[PDB]
Design a protein around this ligand. Sequence first.
Ligand SMILES: Nc1nc2c(ncn2[C@@H]2O[C@H](COP(=O)(O)OP(=O)(O)NP(=O)(O)O)[C@@H](O)[C@H]2O)c(=O)[nH]1
Ligand SMILES: [Mg+2]
Lengths: 166, 77
Amino acid sequence: MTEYKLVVVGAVGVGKSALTIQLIQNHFVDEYDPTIEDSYRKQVVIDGETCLLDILDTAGQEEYSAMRDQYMRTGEGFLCVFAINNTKSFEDIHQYREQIKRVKDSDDVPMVLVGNKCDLAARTVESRQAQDLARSYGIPYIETSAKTRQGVEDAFYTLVREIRQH
Amino acid sequence: ESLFVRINAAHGFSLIQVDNTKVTMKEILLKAVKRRKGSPQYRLEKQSEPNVAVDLDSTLESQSAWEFCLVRENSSR
Ligand SMILES: Nc1nc2c(ncn2[C@@H]2O[C@H](COP(=O)(O)OP(=O)(O)NP(=O)(O)O)[C@@H](O)[C@H]2O)c(=O)[nH]1
Ligand SMILES: [Mg+2]
């Protein structure tokens, strides 16, 4: 069947792995174990149509930034994740989008701006600012919590819908 | 960049950080199972030697390999 290569990118600690494992295994990862790179494949039904998700969970650690080229070339949709309590991670979003352009010649690839950890009371990134950033990119903004599962399916499934509608 | 080993599993791959090549294959297996499956028995195989379980008490260095398959003991790669 049809397989979609989705890639989860963003700064250290924003919750890329927790989002991925919440989707794949319906489980919240409490501990922090830094990622180098991991992939997870799962069959899912989106809008009544079965497909295979191939999710690439990537390193926020800049030590591994050279990997970006490989996976940005073949990635078919991207979750650009920041944490709502981490303004630096929001600032970092642009760098991921720009690197995707270096290898795709464009940023014309399905992407979702993901503001994660929305279960936390303290927010340093304003919702209107995240909405405005997504608007400046022409992409959706979705608030998620890998802990409560809020918005998680919406974030990943929106990518698949955007690929299907090309 | 740290050293790391590539683990090929039933539903994807995991890059497993190692501090040095004196780490045991048992330690690598436990890390890969924890990450990929969370809380069935498993073996590791050298990428270039299918169907043979590596000695989990041996060191990564002794394997002369940096890619392994994680296989359920009741199954094949
Ligand atoms: N409260 C809350 N905590 C979260 C959420 N997502 C992740 N975390 C926590 O934040 C920490 C880092 O999460 P993790 O998924 O490992 O982040 P990462 O972006 O994958 N880090 P790296 O880039 O090094 O791989 C973990 O302790 C995790 O429990 C969330 O939505 N809500
Ligand atoms: Mg991670």
